[PDB]
Design a protein around this ligand. Structure first.
Ligand code: HEM
Length: 154
């Protein structure tokens, strides 16, 4: 009732390429986020001490968090819009535990698209970029609704 079947299949086709190397893609995506929007780094008490790109690449903890982030997102994408159960705990941990504005989810969405385009251009042309953009838009709209339900405006 938001993406068409064909759009979902484009999303899952490129996501399969991510799955070939989750740790690498995860690392790349978090570094791209922090490099482009340094203010996001302040939300992470465990990585705030990291001062250069090399130190980031070498950090076991950052790489582990990358896998955690992408595992969770992939589980959501594979639901093709039917992600209520999976989305609710994610909203709670980003709305009460830690307070992550919708703006910053926008920033990490841009980082994901940047990295997919950098690594898989042959499989991420305009139609695929559009489909992925839509799926990340849907993720953001629905987590924003859950944010509000919990008392956080986002
Ligand atoms: C595609 C978007 C994202 C996904 C799928 C995601 C997912 C997760 C997951 C699975 C965890 C671990 C436990 C939990 O659920 O809290 C986590 C933790 C966290 N996330 Fe996110 N996250 C996303 C975006 C962000 C953004 C944009 C920020 C901050 C700029 C952020 C900040 C954090 C923080 C501060 C923690 C706690 C880590 C710790 O200290 O152990 N997340 N995230």
């Amino acid at each position: 009732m938001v993406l068409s079947e064909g759009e979902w299949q484009l999303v899952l086709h490129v996501w399969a390429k991510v799955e070939a190397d989750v740790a690498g893609h995860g690392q790349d995506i978090l570094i791209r986020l922090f490099k482009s929007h340094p203010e996001t780094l302040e939300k992470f008490d465990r990585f705030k001490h990291l001062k250069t790109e090399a130190e980031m690449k070498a950090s076991e903890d950052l790489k582990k968090h990358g896998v955690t982030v992408l595992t969770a997102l992939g589980a959501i994408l594979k639901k093709k819009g039917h992600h209520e159960a999976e989305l609710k705990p994610l909203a709670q941990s980003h709305a009460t535990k830690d307070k992550i504005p919708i703006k910053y989810l926008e920033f990490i969405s841009e980082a994901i698209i940047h990295v997919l385009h950098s690594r898989h251009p042959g499989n991420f042309g305009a139609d695929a970029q559009g489909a992925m953009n839509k799926a990340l838009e849907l993720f953001r709209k629905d987590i924003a609704a859950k944010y509000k339900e919990l008392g956080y405006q986002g």
